[PDB]
From a paper:
Through symmetry operation, all the trimers are found to be a part of the hexameric quaternary structure of scMenB. The active site of scMenB in complex with HNA-CoA is closely similar to that of ecMenB in complex with HNA-CoA. The similarities include the hydrogen-bonding stabilization of the carbonyl oxygen in the ligand by backbone amides of Gly-77 and Gly-123, hydrophobic interactions between the aromatic ring in the ligand with side chains of Leu-96, Val-98, Leu-99, and the hydrogen bonding interaction between the phenolic hydroxyl of the ligand and the side-chain hydroxyl of Ser-151. In addition, there is also a hydrogen-bonding network interacting with C1-OH of HNA-CoA, which involves the carboxyl side chain of Asp-153, the backbone amide of Gly-123, three water molecules and the backbone carbonyl oxygen of Phe-152 (data not shown). Moreover, the hydroxyl groups of Tyr-87 from the ordered active-site loop and Tyr-248 from the opposing subunit also form a strong hydrogen bond with an O−H⋅⋅⋅O distance of 2.9 Å. Furthermore, in the scMenB: HNA-CoA structure a chloride ion occupies the bicarbonate binding site (data not shown), similar to that in the ecMenB:HNA-CoA complex. One of them is a strong hydrogen bond between the strictly conserved A-loop Arg-82 and the backbone carbonyl oxygen of the C-helix Gly-253, and the other polar loop-helix interaction is a hydrogen bond between the backbone carbonyl oxygen of Arg-82 and the side chain guanidinium group of Lys-257. In the scMenB complexes, the side chain benzene ring of Phe-260, which corresponds to ecMenB Phe-270, also forms hydrophobic contact with the adenine ring of the ligands. In addition, the adenylate 3′-phosphate group of the ligand is also stabilized by a ligand-induced salt bridge with the side chain of scMenB Lys-263, which is equivalent to ecMenB Lys-273.
Numbering used by the authors:
A (entry chain A), C (entry chain D): 1 to 275
B (entry chain C): 2 to 275
Amino acid sequence: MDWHIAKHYDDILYYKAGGIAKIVINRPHKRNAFRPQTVFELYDAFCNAREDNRIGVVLLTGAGPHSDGKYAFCSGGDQSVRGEGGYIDDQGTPRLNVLDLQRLIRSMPKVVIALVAGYAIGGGHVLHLVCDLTIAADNAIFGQTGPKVGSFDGGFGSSYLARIVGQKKAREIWYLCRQYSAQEAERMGMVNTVVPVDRLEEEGIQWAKEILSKSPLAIRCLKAAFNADCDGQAGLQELAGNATLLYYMTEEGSEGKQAFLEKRPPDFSQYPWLP
Amino acid sequence: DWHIAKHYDDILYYKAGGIAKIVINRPHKRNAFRPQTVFELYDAFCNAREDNRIGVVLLTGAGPHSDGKYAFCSGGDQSVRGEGGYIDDQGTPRLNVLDLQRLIRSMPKVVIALVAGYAIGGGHVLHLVCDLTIAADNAIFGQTGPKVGSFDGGFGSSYLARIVGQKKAREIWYLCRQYSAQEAERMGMVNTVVPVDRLEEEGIQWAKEILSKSPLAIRCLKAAFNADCDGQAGLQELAGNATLLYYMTEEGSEGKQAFLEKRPPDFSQYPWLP
Amino acid sequence: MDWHIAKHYDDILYYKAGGIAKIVINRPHKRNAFRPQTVFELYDAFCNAREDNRIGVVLLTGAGPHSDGKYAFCSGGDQSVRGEGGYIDDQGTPRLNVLDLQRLIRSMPKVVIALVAGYAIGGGHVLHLVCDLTIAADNAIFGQTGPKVGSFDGGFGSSYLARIVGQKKAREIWYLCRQYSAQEAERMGMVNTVVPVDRLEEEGIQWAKEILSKSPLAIRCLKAAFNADCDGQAGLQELAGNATLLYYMTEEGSEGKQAFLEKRPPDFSQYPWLP
Ligand SMILES: CC(C)(COP(=O)(O)OP(=O)(O)OC[C@H]1O[C@@H](n2cnc3c(N)ncnc32)[C@H](O)[C@@H]1OP(=O)(O)O)[C@@H](O)C(=O)NCCC(=O)NCCSC(=O)c1ccc2ccccc2c1O
Ligand SMILES: CC(C)(COP(=O)(O)OP(=O)(O)OC[C@H]1O[C@@H](n2cnc3c(N)ncnc32)[C@H](O)[C@@H]1OP(=O)(O)O)[C@@H](O)C(=O)NCCC(=O)NCCSC(=O)c1ccc2ccccc2c1O
Ligand SMILES: CC(C)(COP(=O)(O)OP(=O)(O)OC[C@H]1O[C@@H](n2cnc3c(N)ncnc32)[C@H](O)[C@@H]1OP(=O)(O)O)[C@@H](O)C(=O)NCCC(=O)NCCSC(=O)c1ccc2ccccc2c1O
Ligand SMILES: [Cl-]
Ligand SMILES: [Cl-]
Ligand SMILES: [Cl-]
């Protein structure tokens, strides 16, 4: 596919083609671990994709293979910049800004697909989970390490994982910190499909296209609806927000706006009280 | 064996022993429901709810059709769809399947979807809200909303996610692909798969295993499962059953008699248990 | 492994070795059914394990094989002592005290692993479910019987089961009261791994050891986090409670304590308001 570069970053690469955007984590020397900068850039890129009216689907993946032949989606938080209370940015401030990225991916009204080749570990594992869909290469390796490396993600990393693979498997994943193959990840319900490494991107594009032929309004409403099963009032905000969006496309709704601007009482008398 | 219980235009309705059977009968539209179909379905389920002998309802689609094809339900009849809903005979737009969803979900009888061939769109959601699903090996499952300009962001989304998990639920809705009976079982939304010509017999077999159980235990469990999903509405069903059971106690009856006899109640004999 | 007896009980056995405790239900004549006393002792043992700072993992299992060659994890509430409103203890009081045990297993900040050989039925099934993890022998048999024997567990027995195997299977389990093999139990997501009968304990020990090499603080926080997806404010209590525990290890927190004891206003001016 004709990928065009959309913006230049230090830690990532960002492209667009038709209704598809592609974001690539580009720190293969650290198994694509994110440092605070990486997250800022990821945030910026996803935000860009959110703002682009032509983009309906974002493919997220890791740069590879590395000089050692190994693939990686993301290895999570860069431990070489970790200190007191978080990951230290260039200015000395401790951060856990991936939490903001998690929220953006989760709430943005575009479908996000993780394309996992090789390692999706730790925060990189949580990143794949929060994407709407996951397509794995048959060399993909999934797991958490928190309790081994002195961390934990007790937010979407735990609760949301449990809403994917159930409570028994979710706990196993976190407590033992083992590694799981692509086939195991699919069997437990956290990977949508598995393809050969050299077919990964093409599968991503194929899935993106099947989505891009759908109604954008139906898709955004559904995404909000799924979030509403998890995120209480925050979820209701997204779902009700879309109801308001749709209501702002009605004649009935516009009558209320015009009435105010024209400084007259609104006339809703023609509109029925449906069952 | 099956005795007809009431006559309808769009559906068929039978009863035998503790089992009722409701059949969507519009095979010319792959058993799509129009507002009338829903009214009749509602009426039939309500009837089944009211019948003290009925413990289990089997829900299925009429088939095979003249073209040899099977269908459970294809969802909302798009040929009667207009502004704001599906237009009934009287011109009023409706989404009354939402009421049917609620009745199936809340009624204290076990409802089993028997899916042969297509369970698509609103027909897919209908199978989901039934307590159990038994599929024929020719069954085909899927959503189409984002393709045909619709969506079910209620039980169609959230409840689906409580069955197959969030990853698969989203795939189902976003891509609108079709899934085989075997795939549907593997992902957790179908309870078992049998050959087409064994579907009804399997339904009857499952119904019978349920019919030999305590009706009180079953209704309490169904409410309990709903309570994990439906907040205060779910608590209403569950607490409601607690009240029903409390109205079978001597302690509870003392309170009633005391009021009717215009005297203060005496609960002093009853302990405050741990 | 060198198991040392830790305390004597009538209905159960209790051992400890390294960071592992083992609790065994010992009433094989009733397929390890629990009577009120059994629950009291189980509670006491788990509570002991909770109090022991060396113990990080508890293995729960049933005594066997029985004289008839049959294995059992637990067969649930002892129906021979069941009367009006509950299971009658030795003093005549009806009880459903297993509900308290369920809560202790679920909330205690140690990982609990059910090792299921043969029958895990009824309340014994629910007991396996509330344990964090389940390892089954390939002879394991799982199921509920409530609607057959005039009972039901509409608490963790229903809702939590549904958070493991999904709503369709959970309902099947309860409505039909069939039996399910170890392989079926794994396939539906309620068993973490299946091993041969004579490997069950060794697998338990192996899993326990992989957990015991992890950070205890990370593990307790994760366990609370998983409970928070299910138990509303009770879940928030456990999770927030751990946040308080961690806050009580900070210098910032200690300044507040010292200020009060020294009868002076606290000085938090040096501490930043992080993003
Ligand atoms: C699982 C691997 C993907 C690959 O193994 P492999 O053997 O193939 O290569 P390896 O030698 O281990 O690594 C390759 C090189 O890249 C480095 N590297 C790999 N992954 C990371 C990494 N994640 N961070 C820093 N460096 C990394 C390695 O150190 C090494 O560098 P080098 O020795 O050449 O100098 C492995 O490297 C590994 O164990 N990585 C560590 C995973 C990890 O512990 N992540 C942190 C847990 S917490 C997490 O991600 C996270 C993040 C944000 C959070 C925010 C709020 C709340 C919670 C958060 C959270 O839990
Ligand atoms: C996937 C099939 C099951 C069957 O394939 P097949 O190729 O074998 O059949 P087909 O080619 O369509 O031919 C069958 C005949 O039956 C008709 N038919 C089948 N299903 C429907 C139908 N649902 N409505 C109207 N006509 C239908 C076809 O038009 C056609 O008639 P013909 O062209 O020969 O004159 C396919 O036909 C199909 O996509 N049918 C339409 C499914 C559909 O998208 N329904 C609406 C989605 S939403 C829905 O049901 C719904 C309902 C209520 C809701 C309420 C609140 C919120 C959301 C709701 C909701 O999302
Ligand atoms: C699958 C078995 C579990 C095994 O069959 P098997 O044929 O191999 O053994 P079996 O011959 O039937 O039984 C062996 C001996 O142990 C006895 N036994 C086995 N299980 C139990 C048992 N659970 N209670 C009392 N006795 C039991 C048998 O009666 C028999 O006694 P014996 O004739 O030698 O004198 C079977 O024994 C059996 O179905 N046992 C009954 C299981 C059961 O119904 N438990 C009660 C469901 S409800 C429950 O556990 C429960 C508990 C607390 C709750 C608290 C709050 C809310 C709900 C609760 C709740 O639902
Ligand atoms: Cl981790
Ligand atoms: Cl649909
Ligand atoms: Cl039971």
